[PDB]
C-alpha cells in the first residue's frame, strides 16, 4: 500500500498505487468503475477490503536552455509534478 | 469578449495504451503522429499566451 506497484487481481492486470479506500462498497460489489468510467477501486479476494487504484505519478518533462551558443547549462521542469517525487 | 482558452497537453502514448507495456512498443510503428499532435497543442498554447 502507498507504493506504486504492479498488481494482478484475479487476472486484473495493471500498475498503480494502492491505498485505503473510503468507498461504501456494498456486499455484492466486487470492483468499482466509480468516476469518469475508470476502474477506481477493486475488492481484495482474500481480505475482502476495497483498495483505491491510482496510476502512479506521471508528467511531461520540459528542458530550459539559454542556447548552445551561450552555455551548455540546462534547467529541467517536471510539469504538474510535486517536488517531493520529482 | 473571450481572449484565451485552456492550454491542453496530452500524452498520446498513455492515452492510447493507458500505460501498458505491451502495445507501447506497437504504437512506435505508426510514426510521428505524437510529435504532430504535441507541436500543434504547443502552438495553440503559445498562441493563447
Amino acid at each position: 500500500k502507498n507504493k506504486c506497484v504492479n498488481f494482478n487481481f484475479n487476472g486484473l492486470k495493471g500498475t498503480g498505487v494502492l491505498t485505503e479506500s473510503n468507498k461504501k462498497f456494498l456486499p455484492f460489489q466486487q470492483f468499482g468503475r466509480d468516476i469518469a468510467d475508470t476502474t477506481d477501486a477493486v475488492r481484495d479476494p482474500q481480505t475482502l477490503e476495497i483498495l483505491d487504484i491510482t496510476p502512479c505519478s506521471f508528467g511531461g518533462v520540459s528542458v530550459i536552455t539559454p542556447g548552445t551558443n551561450t552555455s551548455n547549462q540546462v534547467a529541467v521542469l517536471y510539469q504538474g509534478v510535486n517536488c517531493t517525487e520529482v | 469578449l473571450p481572449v484565451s482558452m485552456t492550454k491542453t497537453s496530452v500524452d498520446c502514448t498513455m492515452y492510447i495504451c493507458g500505460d501498458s507495456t505491451e502495445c507501447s512498443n506497437l504504437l512506435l510503428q505508426y510514426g510521428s503522429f505524437c510529435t504532430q499532435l504535441k507541436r500543434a497543442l504547443t502552438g495553440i498554447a503559445v498562441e493563447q499566451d
Binding site: T38, F58, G59, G60, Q79, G80 | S4, T6, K7, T8, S9, V10, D11, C12, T13, M14, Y15, G18, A45, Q48, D49
Partner: peptide, 22 residues
C-alpha cells in the same frame, strides 16, 4: 464569481496570472 469551471490529459497554466492581468 459569475463563471465557473488522469488518463494522459493535463492543463497548463497561463503565463500571466489573474493578479498580473488585474
Amino acid at each position: 464569481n459569475k463563471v465557473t469551471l488522469f488518463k494522459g490529459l493535463t492543463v497548463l497554466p497561463p503565463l500571466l496570472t489573474d493578479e498580473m492581468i488585474a
